[PDB]
């Protein structure tokens, strides 16, 4: 059972992608070689990939995509890439055409969870509560039916680049301009204030099991929630996970404001440093970090 | 100095339809176009082997396993003329995104979404677009259907009418809910309408597209334009554009509608429709003042406008 791990990436989260790879390699129970996508698109293989990892960065690669990798040697690919060209279904489509079982969500689930607009429409239709939002498409002036403060975001960029907290309606045009530099579609979310940020991990194919609830202030595991709020968070995570058809894993971020929950975002490739939120959430749930990785590889083969 | 790579064939059950559309596109496309054929075994046929395959109308075996050893740098646009799974579902689109190669048609998210009968209905219903009542049934979770038979049972990501069965009584649901799970881990159970008129509309453009006249299906007769009350024609077109806009489709789509008696329902969006010179989507825009060569030209130009200027 040979496992391929892909890390790095062209996204602004290339640095944290290599840090997550360093953690998986140490504790993954399977033989695992490392391949790295440098920040210029070209890949690094072999010991050249290990060289990029021990340096925590890789600004330039050697082989253009697709690389001369021996895909038949591996049974599972672990795409540990964050954001565009990682969590958006492009890599997953290349792997589906390779015929390789891989860790994480499929093409549809990755692309949908990546789109902050289309994911909310699916969830809102399935009864899952989400933050009030409106999509704005480039060239089309916006109709925002709610008052500031807003969050203006590119719908498919991720990595929090191009996001604007908008306090005045007159600042909206400049916020959409900044977002449209990264995507053709933008979202305008009602900023909840004050608000608590809750995160929960899911593990499984479609029908998943929820981790304990965490809270971001440091990370409080378990979060100090009343027992009814805690169950509803885990219930809404598993429901969204099911409706969207996520496979492998997801970190489901929620907002809690005035006793009301709002699903914010599903992250299909969360941080995976032994100190990141997703693996620590399942630690407190009784799933050891190496055991978490075995479950991820085994779920790919099913 | 523009050159197009046309990919056709595919592993999906629509393999022969894809080749039939490639011949039609190759005959009239106004660009130097090289043809690549995906065989039914997933292996690629390149060069004159691809053209030879186009004459047999069926390439079950291929020579090169994925990825094909093509010189991607000699192609400015890829035209994925593949139908169904591993063609319309976003996989090939995502590979072409990673290549930095402009391509015709819907992107990754729109292709995966429009192919999922369950998820596209959820987005369209959330937008107000009318859809036939349905329920998703996943492998294991027992079937909880909120309505009574008759109901069609489909795979959620079916290429074209593979594993679909009309169910007149609930006793036959389990057998129907097993021919569908041979092709997809998720199924849909839609309320069967009777009687139904099938209406189809072509859309062209990136996100904000233009609609063709509406046609009707009854081999199969294509009534262009469809014998419809005048408000019903403009509603079907506006309902195709809004759906096109919400899903963020690029390049093209053939939006199919149901008409029971007076009740209008959007059925499914087809991001890579059939493209023989006589298929509905070319015939639709043919009646709209867009000749088949001009239709192909704008499709190629719409791919270049998005990748280089958007």
Curated annotation (Swiss-Prot), chain A:
Cell inner membrane listed as a keyword: no
Annotated cofactor note: Binds 2 magnesium or manganese ions per subunit.
Binding site for Mg(2+) 1: 253, 265
Cofactor(s) the protein requires to work: Mg(2+); Mn(2+)
Alphabetized Gene3D superfamilies for the sequence: 3.40.50.20, ATP-grasp fold, A domain (3.30.1490.20), ATP-grasp fold, B domain (3.30.470.20)
Domain (ATP-grasp) ranges: 120-298
Positions contributing to Mg(2+) 2 binding: 265, 267
GO biological process: cell wall organization; peptidoglycan biosynthetic process; regulation of cell shape
Stored PROSITE patterns: ATP_GRASP, DALA_DALA_LIGASE_1, DALA_DALA_LIGASE_2
Cell location: Cytoplasm
Entry-linked InterPro entries: ATP-grasp, ATP_grasp_subdomain_1, D-Ala_lig_Van_CS, D_ala_D_ala, Dala_Dala_lig_C, Dala_Dala_lig_N, PreATP-grasp_dom_sf
Binding site for ATP: 147-198
Catalysis performed (reactions): 2 D-alanine + ATP = D-alanyl-D-alanine + ADP + phosphate + H(+)
GO MF annotations in UniProt: ATP binding; D-alanine-D-alanine ligase activity; metal ion binding
Key words of the record: ATP-binding, Cell shape, Cell wall biogenesis/degradation, Cytoplasm, Ligase, Magnesium, Manganese, Metal-binding, Nucleotide-binding, Peptidoglycan synthesis
Keyword Nucleus: no
SUPFAM superfamilies: Glutathione synthetase ATP-binding domain-like (SSF56059), PreATP-grasp domain (SSF52440)
Primary location class: cytoplasm
Pathway field: Cell wall biogenesis; peptidoglycan biosynthesis
Pfam families tied to this protein: Dala_Dala_lig_C, Dala_Dala_lig_N
GO cellular component terms attached to this protein's record: cytosol
Family the entry assigns: Belongs to the D-alanine--D-alanine ligase family.
Record-linked PANTHER family: D-ALANINE--D-ALANINE LIGASE, D-ALANINE--D-ALANINE LIGASE A
Function: Cell wall formation.
Name of the protein in its database record: D-alanine--D-alanine ligase
Organism the protein comes from: Thermus thermophilus (strain ATCC 27634 / DSM 579 / HB8)
Gene name of the encoded protein: ddl
């Amino acid at each position: 059972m040979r496992v391929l791990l892909i890390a790095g990436g062209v996204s602004p989260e290339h640095e944290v992608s290599l840090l997550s790879a360093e953690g998986v390699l140490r504790h993954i129970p399977f033989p695992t070689d490392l391949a790295v996508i440098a920040q210029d698109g070209r890949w690094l293989l072999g010991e050249k990939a290990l060289t990029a990892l021990e340096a925590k960065a890789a600004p330039e690669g050697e082989h253009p995509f697709p690389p001369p990798l021996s895909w038949e040697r591996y049974d599972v690919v672990f795409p540990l890439l964050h954001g565009r060209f990682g969590e958006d279904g492009t890599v997953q489509g290349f792997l589906e055409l390779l015929g390789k079982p891989y860790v994480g969500a499929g093409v549809a689930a990755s692309a949908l969870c990546m789109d902050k607009d289309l994911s909310k429409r699916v969830l809102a239709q399935a009864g899952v509560p989400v933050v009030p939002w409106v999509a704005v498409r480039k060239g089309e002036p916006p109709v925002v039916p709610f008052d500031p403060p807003f969050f203006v975001k590119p719908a498919n960029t991720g990595s929090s680049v191009g996001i604007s907290r908008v306090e005045r309606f007159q600042d909206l045009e400049a916020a959409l301009a900044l977002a449209f530099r990264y995507d053709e579609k933008a979202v305008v979310e009602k900023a909840l204030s004050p608000v608590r940020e809750l995160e929960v991990g899911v593990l499984g194919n479609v029908f998943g099991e929820a981790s304990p609830v965490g809270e971001v202030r440091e990370l409080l595991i378990p979060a100090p929630l009343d027992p009814g709020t805690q169950e509803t968070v885990q219930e809404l995570a598993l429901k969204a996970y099911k409706v969207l058809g996520v496979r492998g894993m997801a970190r489901v971020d929620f907002f809690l404001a005035e006793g009301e929950l709002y699903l914010n975002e599903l992250n299909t490739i969360p941080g995976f440093t032994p100190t990141s939120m997703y693996p620590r959430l399942f630690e407190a749930g009784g799933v050891a970090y190496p055991e978490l990785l075995r479950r991820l590889v085994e779920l790919a083969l099913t």
